[PDB]
């Protein structure tokens, strides 16, 4: 194969190589040949870091927009910033905060624009959101957020698509049994909630 100077091997060939021609202008396209197969190397590091620094500029502007949203409110665009950035702590906090304020204020489970924004999203964002839902469900403290997000995914998406994504049964086998455990536990809290009903019938019998 070819090497540069003790670093940066190249893709290679299968056999011996008596060929190197770097004799372009500064050092443009460089040639290197095996017995028969040719190789044409491009250029200097002028755009394959320029792309890196412009996507870094976009990343530092959209991370700052996520901080400003997570400050001021507007949980929906903060949510899609968290999904595009894969910031899971911020994603859990925005879903918890939006769920709690939807509990306080007044089919629809988050605020209407947020759960429409969960309806519109693609298969890659949906599979990473269900991965986060899968391991928020393994608690018992942070499982309510996970169950609400599972509910909006289920009642806002197409079920045949949800099934036929590759990877969405190796998640739903991970959050059927934790949900079955939680359904048993919350059902048992309902069942042992009847000591208030018993204390009421004793306080009524009282006289």
């Amino acid at each position: 194969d070819g090497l540069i100077k003790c670093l940066k091997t190249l893709d290679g060939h299968n056999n011996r190589l008596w060929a190197l021609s770097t004799m372009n202008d500064g050092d443009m396209i460089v040639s290197a040949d095996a017995d028969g197969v040719f190789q044409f190397w491009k250029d200097c590091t002028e755009q394959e870091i320029e792309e890196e620094q412009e996507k870094a500029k976009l990343q530092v502007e959209q991370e700052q927009s996520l901080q400003n949203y997570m400050s001021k409110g507007d949980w929906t665009n903060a949510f899609l910033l968290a999904m595009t950035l894969d910031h899971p702590m911020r994603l859990f906090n925005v879903l918890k905060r939006a769920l709690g304020e939807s509990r306080s204020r007044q089919e629809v489970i988050f605020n209407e624009e947020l759960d429409q924004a969960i309806s519109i999203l693609n298969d890659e964002q949906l599979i990473l959101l269900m991965k986060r839902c899968r391991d928020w469900n393994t608690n018992a403290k942070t499982h309510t957020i996970a169950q609400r997000t599972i509910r909006c995914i289920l009642m806002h998406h197409n079920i045949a698509k949800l099934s036929e994504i590759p990877g969405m049964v190796k998640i739903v086998d991970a959050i059927i049994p934790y949900t079955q455990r939680h359904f048993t536990r919350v059902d048992n809290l309902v069942e042992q909630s009847y000591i208030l009903d018993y204390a009421l019938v004793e306080m009524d019998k009282l006289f």
Binding site: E63, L85, D86, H87, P88, M89, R90, F92, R132, R134, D135, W136, N137, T138, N139, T142, D173, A174
Partner: protein
């Protein structure tokens, strides 16, 4: 299924379930998770 370490490199996922990203972790929290990681290294 039990929540191991991350399937990424910038992610820190706990047996709690709460996953964090090393871009959003502030520096005092980075030192905090590094020292806790060191304690679970020594034990």
């Amino acid at each position: 299924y039990n929540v191991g370490k991350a399937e990424k490199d910038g992610e820190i996922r706990l047996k709690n379930g709460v996953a964090m990203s090393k871009e959003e972790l502030t520096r005092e929290d980075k030192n905090r998770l590094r020292r806790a990681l060191k304690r679970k290294r020594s034990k």
